[PDB]
Design a binder for this molecule. Structure first.
Ligand SMILES: OC[C@H]1O[C@@H](n2cnc3c(NC4CCCC4)ncnc32)[C@H](O)[C@@H]1O
Length: 278
């Protein structure tokens, strides 16, 4: 599939840099014709077939195709796509209140109500995605943005669909691998992957929201990955003595090695706490 090949500078002005990945930079921008503001993600293209640098056409097209489908208050929208020789440029929804997650770093420890207010929104976004058989595969606090701080009212949107896949046969087998602290054992063990991997990541995010501590983090990436595969975590009393038994129960039912035994997104919404690499 091809994208708009006019110069993006003829239609938009860019401003502040909003963030970065290894092969991507995101900038605030403004559409000249409407004055409306967006975020433009510039993704570096591969310069050859066998190149390790940049993102393959197939991977870019997949992200774009997923972004085109989705429309939900807790997930980003896509506005336009441009491309030139070096970049594909996604123009989408500007989320201006920063990462979850710089908010977690700047702020003191959260109450359970605070944590569940964020968490319920993440669950609603993921419920939408999973209903569509879309696995995000990269859920982590850096990919949960506030829309808003300020309106607190602290509404969120899930971002960065670079690893997302349609799961039309129950699982995908192709070496998808996110950030060690947040990946499920099946990712670590290079096993077939499905919607369940996202539910594990939600358990990790929930543990961090409540405690300020990362459940599997070691001093090196290999240690982190070994910890994940072995389900080597515990609830430290120093961090969790204030925390309700139901909150711990919710996390315990997500941080389960066997994907088939892990809570699903629907299970997570019915749970008594919620129900109203190298
Ligand atoms: O993903 C790298 C970092 O850039 C930041 N980031 C990524 N995407 C966005 C975005 N809108 C997406 C709509 C479609 C294109 C962009 N809006 C604001 N910040 C973003 C965030 O800090 C993230 O951790």
């Amino acid at each position: 599939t091809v994208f708009r090949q006019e110069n993006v500078d003829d239609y938009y002005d860019t401003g502040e840099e909003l963030g970065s990945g290894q092969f991507a930079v995101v900038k605030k921008c403004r559409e000249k014709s409407t004055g409306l503001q967006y975020a433009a993600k510039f993704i570096k293209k591969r310069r050859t077939k066998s190149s390790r640098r940049g993102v393959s056409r197939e991977d870019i097209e997949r992200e774009v195709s997923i972004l085109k489908e989705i429309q939900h208050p807790n997930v980003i929208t896509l506005h336009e796509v441009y491309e030139n020789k070096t970049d594909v440029i996604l123009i989408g929804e500007l989320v201006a209140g920063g990462e979850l997650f710089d908010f977690l770093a700047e702020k003191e420890s959260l109450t359970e109500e605070e944590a569940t207010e964020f968490l319920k929104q993440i669950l609603n976004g993921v419920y939408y995605l999973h209903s569509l058989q879309i696995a995000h595969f990269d859920l982590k606090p850096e990919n949960i943005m506030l829309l808003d701080r300020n309106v607190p009212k602290p509404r969120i949107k899930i971002i960065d669909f670079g690893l997302a896949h349609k799961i039309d046969f129950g699982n995908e087998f192709k070496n998808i691998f996110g950030t060690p602290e947040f990946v499920a054992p099946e990712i670590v063990n290079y096993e077939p992957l499905g919607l369940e991997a996202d539910m594990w990541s939600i358990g990790v995010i929930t543990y961090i929201l409540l405690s300020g501590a990362s459940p599997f983090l070691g001093d090196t990436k290999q240690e982190t990955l070994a910890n994940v595969s072995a389900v080597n975590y515990e609830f430290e009393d120093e961090y969790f003595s204030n925390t309700s038994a139901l909150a711990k129960d919710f996390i315990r039912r997500l941080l389960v090695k066997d994907p088939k035994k892990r809570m699903t997104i629907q299970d997570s919404l019915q749970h008594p706490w919620i129900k109203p690499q190298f």
